[PDB]
């Protein structure tokens, strides 16, 4: 069976790459606003400068991750002014300057699907000092010491890389990721990218406005798809709800007793002399450390997984983007063509193009070709025939030719391969001569 | 980190503050970033490649006998359009 | 860090189990005792579960680096940035203490010249293509010459392929082709 | 008990076995194209050089 036509279909990947980075103060958490427990915290050695330590490493591996899989270009390239690629059409992705920062449509749409909080990323003491009905989740949590720190890169610098990415990777090919970028016209580069995968240059000179056309109607499905439906981009939203969320139990688990008289610090001065008050006192101490440890434990967990995540994500990014892939089912389903990165809160979506044939038929095949006892082999093809004469074409497309000695190499004897068939071969020498 | 300018560093006489440096370390070059605003490090408007990061896109670095700590804002990288046209390689 | 959490009062007397057991009765020694014994412990704990954490880590850069090894150095990656910046070509590895150290031997252009291109050529209404490499001019004359090094060559017909007519690849040009056959007869 | 039973994992493996026999590579980048055995090694053959 060989097809007949092919599909040009264009699809997505979501890939995180970044968590919040947070920070903990342990004083305000544990003895809250108390001389004594101050005091008497001295005496536990230095669990809070390891808590510290080890809330660090995470905070500045979110910033490593985000710079190795982003920065992967020296130079900032720019598209030209005059925009005509061969009949494509980029405009859906391009950034756009006549807008606030150079975000393109389709990151417009994807800062607004997921961003359901931006959490505080360093928020001033004045936006809520008790003023109004005010005391929301985040300003609860900065009176217990739990902060959240800014990232190194803001998203005006991420949308500066990604389109500095795409504008080389448009302008230049793959030639810009091992030297220095080298114009080529566009549809002579995707010459290069179909003679890759199996498929000689002539069936894309041929059907240059059919590619054109199917890729722009790829683009707009892909992009009223994000508009509409579920908007599936969920992988992004479970690290800020996993994040909250244990925010939220370590603030709640503030109020256990731990089998003491009570939970708060000042009560228990108050109502008990020392040397009765030192044992609820280390009791309440030893529970919030206990409860304090956990958390640092799980994020110290689940920073393993992100930073998976992201060495993932930059392997992809440099093999695809940067060039073409010949590895199966490693960027999109079908054969890969080129892919187009975008920027997303915590994370990068992929754009992979692929090549898919359709519209096969059926033929019958033959290993051989026995002609003045000789077995003549394809140089590169297939023997086909339709019922009545046999011809030489590709296998990833239907393209006969007429048997001929350019086309065909001889090799042994014709009584020594099982299913050979009884056919003549045209030498060009004879014709004209 | 954290907290506005608006006078709270000098915390009046800086004898009801928590740590106990000179009122010096309190008034200086001041610079208000998104992180909290710095104290002690000169703004300047050209770009480098960053050295001491800070956060939202700030870095420092010393830099000139040399002169006190500056800040300025990280540069991605250089400047090159590609001169592209469609019969040209 | 270990070592140093072992001078920690925990609340008790003192952090001498020697000193500890005399001065007092079991009653209260034991209860100082237990108050010590459970800090010293889950310290430990602590410890280990870090060093378990620890260990996943290298393990996972140990793959990596099993990786590399059999791909870079027993064969020739052809991954782009996996075996280094640029075109691979081999590598050779050396050892150090806790670690490997590869060195990757690679392949950059260095010096390029701007050239005017062609898709196809229409000499007797056909189009001919390029088997492996680009057509260029030089201002004049048409070549064929290869992508990633600058050596021109005339346009014969061992070196290009026809297909179809010359009225549908929308930037085909003039020239003409050897036929290396003709002159010879 | 987990959520697939060993028999669909078996029918999976058979899917996939007899898929790769019988149409080589192409069934995994879209549909299934017959093609003789013998032809298939050939034509890896010609992949390993
Ligand atoms: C290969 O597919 C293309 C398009 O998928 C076919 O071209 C279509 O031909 C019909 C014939 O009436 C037109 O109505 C359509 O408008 C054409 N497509 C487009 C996008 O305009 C082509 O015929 C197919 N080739 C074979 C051999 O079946
Ligand atoms: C590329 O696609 C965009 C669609 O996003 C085209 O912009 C549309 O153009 C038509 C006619 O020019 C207008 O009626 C639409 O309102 C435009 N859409 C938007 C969102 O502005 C654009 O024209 C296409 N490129 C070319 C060269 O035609
Ligand atoms: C199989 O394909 C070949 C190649 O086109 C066909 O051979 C020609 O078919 C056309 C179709 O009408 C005839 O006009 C030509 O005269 C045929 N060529 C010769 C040299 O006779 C062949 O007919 C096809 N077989 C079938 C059964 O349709
Ligand atoms: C094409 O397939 C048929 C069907 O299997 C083959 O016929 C078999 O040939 C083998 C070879 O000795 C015999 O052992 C079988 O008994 C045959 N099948 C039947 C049902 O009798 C045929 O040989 C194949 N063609 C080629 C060229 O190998
Ligand atoms: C292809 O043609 C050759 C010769 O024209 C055929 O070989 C002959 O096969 C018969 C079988 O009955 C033998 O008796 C002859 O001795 C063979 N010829 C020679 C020169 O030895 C061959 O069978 C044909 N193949 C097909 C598939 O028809
Ligand atoms: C373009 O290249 C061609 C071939 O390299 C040049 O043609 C030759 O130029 C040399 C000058 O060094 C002459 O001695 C030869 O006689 C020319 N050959 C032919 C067949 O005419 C051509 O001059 C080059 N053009 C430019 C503008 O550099
Ligand atoms: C390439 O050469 C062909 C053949 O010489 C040109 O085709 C002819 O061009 C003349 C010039 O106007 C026309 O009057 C003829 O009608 C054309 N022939 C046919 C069969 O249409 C062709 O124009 C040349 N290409 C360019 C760009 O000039
Ligand atoms: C090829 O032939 C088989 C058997 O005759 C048939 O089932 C199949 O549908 C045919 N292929 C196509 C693409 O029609
Ligand atoms: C905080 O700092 C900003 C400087 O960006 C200033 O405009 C503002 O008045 C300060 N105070 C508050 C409450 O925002
Ligand atoms: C420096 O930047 C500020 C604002 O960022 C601007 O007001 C000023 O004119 C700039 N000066 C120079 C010399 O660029
Ligand atoms: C190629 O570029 C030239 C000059 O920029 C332009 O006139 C021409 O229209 C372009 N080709 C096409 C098919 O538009
Ligand atoms: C090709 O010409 C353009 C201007 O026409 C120039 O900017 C570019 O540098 C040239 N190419 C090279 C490799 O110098």
Known sequence: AIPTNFTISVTTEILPVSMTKTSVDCTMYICGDSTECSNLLLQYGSFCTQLKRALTGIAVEQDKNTQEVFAQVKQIYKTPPIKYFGGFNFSQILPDPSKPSKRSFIEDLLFNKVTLADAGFIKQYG???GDIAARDLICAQKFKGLTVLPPLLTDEMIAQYTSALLAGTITSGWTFGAGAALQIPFAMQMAYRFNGIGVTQNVLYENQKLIANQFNSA???IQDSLSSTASALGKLQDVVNHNAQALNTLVKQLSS????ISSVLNDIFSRLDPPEAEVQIDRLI?????????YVTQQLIRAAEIRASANLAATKMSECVLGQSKRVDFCGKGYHLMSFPQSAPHGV????????PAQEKNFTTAPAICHDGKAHFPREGVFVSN???????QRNFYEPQIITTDNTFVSGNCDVVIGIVNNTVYDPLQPEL | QGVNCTEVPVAIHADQLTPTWRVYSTGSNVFQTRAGCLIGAEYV???????IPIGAGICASYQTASQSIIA????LGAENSVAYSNNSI
């Open chain 2, 72 to 75: 300025y804002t990280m540069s």
């Open chain 1, 387 to 393: 019922g009545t004469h046999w011809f030489v074409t």
């Open chain 1, 286 to 294: 030893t529970g919030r450390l206990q409860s304090l440890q956990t």
């Open chain 1, 257 to 260: 007793k731990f089998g003491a």
């Open chain 1, 349 to 356: 979506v992929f754009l992979h193009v692929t090549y898919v």
């Open chain 1, 127 to 129: 936006d809520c000092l």
């Open chain 2, 45 to 51: 408007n050209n770009s480098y490649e960053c050295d």
């Open chain 1, 219 to 221: 683009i707009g499905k």
